[PDB]
């Protein structure tokens, strides 16, 4: 999970739900 950029993960996971 740390391999990705955290600020980008949560932003991507927010786009999926919305």
């Amino acid at each position: 999970a740390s391999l990705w950029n955290w600020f980008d993960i949560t932003n991507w996971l927010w786009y999926i739900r919305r």
Partner: antibody
Framework: EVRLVESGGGLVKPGGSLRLSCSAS????????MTWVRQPPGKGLEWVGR??????????DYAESVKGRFTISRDNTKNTLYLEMNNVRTEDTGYYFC??????????????????????WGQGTLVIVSS | SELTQDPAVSVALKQTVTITCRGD??????ASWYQKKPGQAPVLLFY???NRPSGIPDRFSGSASGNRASLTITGAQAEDEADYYC????????????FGGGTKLTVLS
């Protein structure tokens, strides 16, 4: 098992410089986010800044009243967090804590970039700014 | 002051007290709670939606609604007398964190 020890505190003149160190053990330091928190005498906790991990390019964020004067870095070969204080002001006086920072984001109800929480703290090192 | 707390609250022994944190970012971000005693490091008590770290008594719990976060202590003990701090983002979507002013809790003896 988790141990965080601050050092480097002392007396510094206004406008001078000082470097605080925080040596860590008992957890995966390289992938851990690390935060500096200070507490002026008789006052509350104040967030100073935090450094992220390898997936974020070791990016650092600072408090607004702190930007331009402090620098946070880390040395993953010695398991140490650093806080370099430049052009130090009298309001910088207080106890400085390092904290192992956790990351939280609820998929269904969260909002990016989630929230950061402080699982483990050191005992703090005192910094006094006086001419 | 992005996050506001009541400066001082008192609770009788074995009774229930609620400590509230208020700010704009709490409408979009969860809060974490910390117990702070003199000469001791802060202790994380609660974070996220319903996360209590192990080793913390179950009488500590957190809730949130609107722009308010709340820490409830159910059946307060004498060792619960300390300062309590909330933490969250300073703005919605921000990379910075911030602490509330803190709340001094007295277990009346």
């Amino acid at each position: 098992e988790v141990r965080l020890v601050e050092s480097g505190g002392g007396l510094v003149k206004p406008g001078g410089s000082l470097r605080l160190s925080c040596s860590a053990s008992g957890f995966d330091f390289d992938n851990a986010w690390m935060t500096w928190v200070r507490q002026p005498p008789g006052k509350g906790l104040e967030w100073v800044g935090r450094i992220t991990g390898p997936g974020e390019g070791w990016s650092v964020d600072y408090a607004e009243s702190v930007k331009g004067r402090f620098t946070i870095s880390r040395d993953n070969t010695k398991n140490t967090l650093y806080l370099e204080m430049n052009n130090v002001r009298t309001e910088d006086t207080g106890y400085y804590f390092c904290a192992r920072t956790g990351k939280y984001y609820d998929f269904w109800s969260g909002y990016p970039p989630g929230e950061e929480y402080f699982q483990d703290w050191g005992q703090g090192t005192l910094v006094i700014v006086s001419s | 002051s992005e996050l506001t707390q009541d400066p001082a609250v008192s609770v009788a022994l074995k009774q229930t007290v609620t400590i509230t944190c208020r700010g704009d970012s709490l409408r979009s971000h969860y809060a974490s709670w910390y117990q702070k005693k003199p000469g001791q490091a802060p202790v994380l008590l609660f974070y996220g939606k319903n996360n209590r770290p192990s080793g913390i008594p179950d009488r500590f719990s957190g809730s949130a609604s609107g722009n308010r976060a709340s820490l409830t202590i159910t059946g307060a003990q004498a060792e619960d007398e300390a300062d309590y701090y909330c933490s969250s983002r300073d703005k919605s979507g921000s990379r910075l964190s911030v602490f509330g002013g803190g709340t001094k809790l007295t277990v009346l003896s």
